[model samples]
Target: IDPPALRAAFAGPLDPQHAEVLLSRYDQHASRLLDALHALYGQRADYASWLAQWLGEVGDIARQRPQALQTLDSTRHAGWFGQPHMLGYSAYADRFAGTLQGVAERVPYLQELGVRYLHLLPFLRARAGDNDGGFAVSDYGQVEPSLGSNDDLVALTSRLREAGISLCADFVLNHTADDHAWAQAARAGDARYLDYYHHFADRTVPDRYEATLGQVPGNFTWVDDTAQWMWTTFYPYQWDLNWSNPAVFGDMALAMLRLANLGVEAFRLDSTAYLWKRIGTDCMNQSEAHTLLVALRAVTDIVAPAVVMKAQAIVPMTQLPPYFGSGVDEGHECHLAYHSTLMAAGWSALALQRGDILHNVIAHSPPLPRHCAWLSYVRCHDDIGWNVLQHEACGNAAQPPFSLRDVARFYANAVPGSYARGESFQVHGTNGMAAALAGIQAAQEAGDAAALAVAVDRLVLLYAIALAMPGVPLIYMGDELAMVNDPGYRDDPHRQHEGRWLHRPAMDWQLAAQRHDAKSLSGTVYRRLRGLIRQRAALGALAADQALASIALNDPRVFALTRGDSFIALHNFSDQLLDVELAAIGVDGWTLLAIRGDGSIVLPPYGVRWLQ
Candidate 1:
């Protein structure tokens, strides 16, 4: 049942305590793990042997886990990530700092932002050049050489853990770079490794699958080396993996657990929806995808229980919740998923200066099972994808008269009267840094102080609403300092075509130094946003585990929502002042916390108020 290398790694008699921990955890979760595996690969002729191979790998990973991590895992509770005080910050290691070591130095800045979860984007070893912003992982087991060695990453994770922060690494579930060792092996005619990715004899089979695939211009890339057409979902250089292969699951699990052993406390399961392919379906969010995730969850629970798995599925709200596990898999899969709907709705509210669509988004937002929460952010390394709101906006008569395309154009500064300073990302997505898209860049350039102030309020309001929402709010890198778009991205040949790079600017240390100076624009945005964060931490109702419901106020300018029956958040989406009678909206007996008010309140343009 044991491979020679795996056996050698566990050769010496293991510590009785380590053995006991592994045995006890596995014994408890074995049934769940086995059920998930059987559901996915039970029909394989070598099912029993393949299961044994995975078990051996699991044992090896558990034995190698650091003593400190094992101790932390023992003391940690299941819902530790759902705490009210938990806040997240996401950045690229090279951009946020210079390297892994440099990122370690910025721990203080992250802590200053009250960040408990740090999601460092795609630092893993990637293709030699043009690697899809590092998502085209060449080797999951190593960090990109420029970022630093794997040891440096371990040191960074350890330092972050001591600072009460969990380091979340992006674990790309769906694909690997064409230069990956396995891909290379497959290209070199290695039969065993050839099964690692989907290689078809021709387009006959891929044609059927491509018929239903979305956002995929082409799925099959003819590879002369392999003498076949390789399935490349995202790009020709990024070959999609075949999750149907048991060895792929076993190897990927080992890779993830190895990172867990290195002290990574969480993983963002990247491209979570596209894990499995089907002939007649969209080849996304398939039943097999959940099966794979749940299996990984069980494996992690048995080995590194303290490590959290967050689904990076950017699907619509209607199809989003299940990534957190549903039905028989309830509360057993990913612990967190991106609230794409909320992020999209926030920008929509700003564009139309109305809250009905945003209200509808929350109204239809489903509550998740216990221990699961959403990840909320205003902007990320990727573009602001408007297509995620398609289902949420369909057939809703309460929505604004403006279409999604119009709202996207408004953000891209394509429409008349648009104040936003941004560019279009592909066809439907909007591309800009948070401050720039909020109109700060345009206002600053035009020397319009009034416009600048409104822009600041707009940015602050967005962060305020995000922080108050039911999830861990993530502050994208440089958003707190109001860093604008990096026009210089076009100078780099590799990045010139990707609009997302416009927002992935390196940390502006010079501007960051002025963040404490209230007179500075950076300081103003930072102070106000940080103030909202501090305020959010104090409210128990803002916790991810608490209730969130849309409050249907008559004012179209105000987006209101209640949290846990005790807290109400009102966000003004308009640039005009609005007076609302709390009693008239059926809200009473609540004291306003963010502003000075009694029963009735006046909402300044782009203002936000917290009531409790």
Candidate 2:
């Protein structure tokens, strides 16, 4: 069928009202769709045929998308994530519930936590044995057998959607497992499939690329059968796709849209910065990389407008804005990007017992385009990469007593008398569960009640900043219950080598049962965080769209900022109590959310306050 006929046939399944909306969306985005395709693959000789092939697949996906989701697309207005009430919870599918169906059963629990979004880490089919925590995808079209079937995933997403929660899945865009169909086909000497990845004849070309590449060891793996050196950016089992090839883009885009059709509302575009490579550079955040993302986004905008693409580029602050699009591509790339700088700064401030770097980082964060927001979080499935904070930590001529290295060491428990119970991950990263890193494990093990109290306060303090920040706040799994690090990873042969598994602990349902018992640690944390979330929902100033003005209070121990105009947030990083003068900050007669001292507001150690 012709393009117009195919498009019409795709919309035939929808009701007249919804059909018009779908076709209208396609018509609106059609120009940009073709434009982005031309921009990315225009240099190729077969650009016309390649574009036609992609268009054909888009039509197929549109026709197969369930009607219920079509209604969701029609109801979506821009900036759906722009609200303080939209808190997020992320977890591993098996660790959180056991299976995809089990995840559906926990929808009520997520709703009780006021979670609007749930990010289940990489539930797709992965390679055999160690698969880099399910990142080495053997097949994009299927779910991990242990997790559940594809239909189970659909049911889970449907259940979460019914509970007013959006489900986000990780889309590993950079590479695929060596056992993937394309990789296997290439291994069998098929010329067409061989073009799908970068295969070098020898080290001559690999050495040239390595000259500019930054990292440990070689980036290429030799395949004896294929008589070529395959480019593996991550691990030997995961082969990076040659994105310059049009077919690779078309196939991966189809895979992503197919998942979107199955009710995945958001995709965390993993390894986004390394999509395109060029010599004499670090081969990250390249212009062509943005072009590729823009093309993918254009396709998504046409097919699934309700779905949001989040760029998982754990890059520095200077390089983050481009992922959100700039100049001609503004608002045309990923709708969300990780705020890694802010996250690292929060940890740095807490470890150093000072807030100057945190305040400066917030002040320096660039403004994002319309309808885009930051994915703010204290911790995630990965390690806390300290290198992202290098530029922010080096503030002018003045340096804090602790260098960024010291902060890493502090978290790793390398520093003397450090309360942190974390391990050094890789060269410049730290890995531990949020509660353990906050000193909960250390204090409890030492049987120090005073230290435990401080640890609990510190944990709440870190989350308070992330929650109040001018973006969507994410709570890592089991963080609300103050769950400690799991040494269980050491017992698993497949997971023992990876230090990041220290933090990816299974959910502690027993500890969760005590969430309401005031005497228990879990109870104190859950109640405090739950109360903050409830209060946050009512504050209009903390909405995702509101402006954040950094308050330069002279005291380095206090990190302060004004969300919008009236709502001022103050967080104490130190363990010592202090009185913050209201008159000094040019504010008076505002009601204090915390305790009022004699002619001043008292900020308890690790205290958080929202003053009107």
Candidate 3:
């Protein structure tokens, strides 16, 4: 029941033989896993049986899918993500290509972009009305008919692997659409199916639950036909699953294992922070939630070695590291996690022209294990939620009383000459507390030359940091070509109300075509990013284990860091000319490896430079 016992159990003759019986088994870290389980279980003995059962189930899943185990071994040996050459693109199946078969044909385009990973936005079957941009899943096994058949998806996965691209898909394990068969059956009084979600018969429990649970700080419909009071975290349609029942955990673990068997290299754990619920608690990122994740990781280790879980927990900076499994003691919950704080900090630096908070955050962020890394990105399908810790900002004296509302208003109201065009997401009600902010290509829409240039530079700067940082840089699909926000979503009745949809633009092949031209903004951004990718791969210091050493610069506009001794990156976000002390940066005899301008290295406003 403890770490020592768990370790002994997994390392004992019985455990290995039992694991071997599972079809394709890859437990490279079985010994370490046992140690981790021991530490975790020592704190919560009540969940020890649940943990053991989950691992046993995982072993069974593995035994049933030997080929998947082989794939996992091959992938683990091949080394994953964080390499400089790694490139990723995200898009809808129907939007990127007509169907799954079409995606296969576009493999060459992906290869040309040096993309090593492709994250296909939820292609799973979903309910007909208000699917919340494919977040609501009706079925895990079935592919949406509009996208393609399940066979087509399998074919596409095979093709992507053959083409040297790993297929990543969203596993909306948290909730299901109201119209999902399970939900529908539950509504029809099926006891088993009804237990799948947190369905209440009346307001008594719902009201009590809502009292402590921090609603995603947005105006959402709170209604359900079966209950007078309901918990609507994001939207009314997305029902929260009942993880209080161990059966839900077992079912989801099996479903996840099955998908791993189907050749999904990575599963994006959607809205993960809200999984475990409790009364009189914020119900986000709780200790029990972590315990569940560790159990899930244990199952994954037992069953699907090649598969990695990408935690989509868009919480504050301090809360992000736990998602990466935080050493053997905590459990390797997720192999990769989005650096939501870094993305937000970068934007704040651009808007505020100060790097104190960003620098402090980078300083405090715990270095991930060599096996895990962050999915560094500027923008994603979701908006840039300023989830940075307010205390950190205050401690550094960068900004005081950082009001989410003011930040929201600044981004939404479009300050003069501002390149960003973003909307306020999860805007709090009459209390006026805002949750997050997201932006689109507003500069392009305004046709402001300076703003557009700054925007492009900001994008490149953020990408440069992501590439240089100790993590795998993820390129949002459209950002590669500097594609603007899709105005089309605004017209769609289904999408219009959701502000997150503003950034989820369609694949604009026309603008993408311009990436080949050096004169074009898209082309320049692509070429610059591609060059960084190439440079990153060539430089050994770009790996995740490489520590980021800060470089002091007198100018507030500039931010600098050295990735070991091999590379140094300097960025300037200010519009005016600013002098930086070369001595402040450790680079004395360093030559400019890459620069945007002529020989002098005069960074125009919002410019980035790479030195060697």
Candidate 4:
């Protein structure tokens, strides 16, 4: 925006103080940020005005931050989530606890789990039946009635914040449910609302785009009632928003600001890559997508500086770093992104009984900006699918002996002596790779005593390394207690069609009750994981500022790494017993951080050892 008009915007509705803050951040990132906005909406007569007007809205949101909610970011600086004690727990609010009030009640439980951050997945009002796990956001301003009211949300956030936990919710950036206000207006034949989405009288554009089909399969859906075709990336009911229009960007910014005012600390920008579309390409990871994020970050830094903007882009190591914003971005672009390649590689390594792939990924995944940190997890709402092409979990390294199909068979328990009993979620890409099933389920279903022991050990190994790794360690709801796949999921019509439901087991509160019974499997995993959290919190070098150094420990079965000056984490992914000297890891005093009570430095099959 031109300087005078921008200044006028700040002089008017925007608080003069917030206007200065906006100018300072804008001055730092103006060039690329402006260039990106131009790329997306320069054609609009109101483009520059859009930028200025949003600055006013951002000021309003900032006012709420300190005045109404009295948020921490109001006093603290940026990079708040990058702290050492960041332990994340993600779950569907309804299934996890029951409702927003249920989530509030669980704040004590969350505190007990050492959870300082929580991701409540897609809790907004959605379509009545089968709303893609509540991802089809029909109402951005309100919570699903079943979940709770927005007032309940305010109470929940206040309670969670008091307990030192920050809330993260999915911002369905790419699309909204077919019943959204905009879509409803479009259905009512409003040209402006129709223009808010991609409306076509013919299939010419979608047909051309389909020539190079996007990462997601379908791009357009027929709306017979509206008598026009609208873009739908994930499903027919989810209409893709037209970011090409400045108005859409302006609207979403206001919607997001409204959410910030509600005390939400972060947004998981859902399906980020598919936000922009052009006729000739597959319409993903477009340069324009990054530009949009930069704009969002620029605004977020000014309005809710403490709020985290996390990307849910599940791409590869090469494509992932940009989300954190490279060089010029000072990593100020997105505060956090999924270390998905690492997450997938860890699971693949567990299946193959090798760490080469996981090690190589950690090595090649370029170090992120100091201000940004990776959000690492062992399992999430989705199934674990290998981004790798072969069984060689180490993509850039030497190829493993098996192909992706073989690895799939192992997880599916279709191979001889295979212990994994995972189910494939074919709705997404697992290829022929039976890339389905939680690791815990696979081993337990193998139904052999020895295999179950190794299964729990492997589960521990996964959680331990993720915890010891250089990012926030997130735990899926039921996985904490070694909860496996829910057989009943296949019977729920509302969820069964979407196969990710297999892993989305309802919180097994029953098993969680046994967390104190040391003899129970739940107790064993819970206690060990809690120990890791405590040890990690005590170690400063393991903080967000540190990085992991991938070292070849002369054994493919061991995923080895040193975290700055903190200590070394060594994990065995195989069932075969392995032995190594402490000197190999270059430790002298040798304080074992994991402390599982099998106090010899020997590495049991699937055992984990962290030494100082």
Off by over 4 Å in 2: 1-18, 397-402, 589-599
Least well predicted 10-residue stretch by lDDT in candidate 1: 1-10
Clashes of each: 0, 0, 6, 5
Task: State the local distance difference test value for candidate 1.
Answer: 0.85
lDDT of 4 by residue, 271-326 (tens): 99888887777788887788889888876765566788999988766777888876
Stretches of candidate 3 off by over 4 Å are 1-60, 64-69, 72-75, 217-232, 326-328, 387-389, 395-407, 425-454, 589-592, 595-602
lDDT digits (tens) for residues 150-219 of candidate 2: 9998998888889989898999989999888898899898999888999999899999999989863578
**All candidates' TM-scores?**
0.96, 0.96, 0.85, 0.92
Residue 411 accuracy (lDDT) in model 4:
67
lDDT of each: 0.85, 0.85, 0.68, 0.75
Question: How many angstroms is residue 293 displaced in model 3 relative to the true structure, after the best TM-score fit?
Answer: 1.1
When sorted by lDDT, best at the front, the candidate numbers are 1, 2, 4, 3
Residue-wise C-alpha lDDT for candidate 3, range 1-612, written one tens digit per residue: 354554333334334544453323334555454554454444544567765666565555565564634555545742366665667777877778768888888888888888888999999998787687788889987888988887887788888888778888999877888778877877676788777777665566766776776656431334444533334567678777877766677678788877776778888898888887777888888766776677677666655566777888877767887886654544367878888777777766766666554566676677776677788877777665654545555554433344444544566654564444565665321100011121225655566666666666667777777778876677777677776655566788766767666666667788778989999877877887788787777777777667776565556677776787777777786777554555566444455454322234455676777777
Q: What is the C-alpha local distance difference test score of candidate 3?
A: 0.68
Clashing pairs in 4: 357-393, 357-394, 421-442, 422-437, 423-437
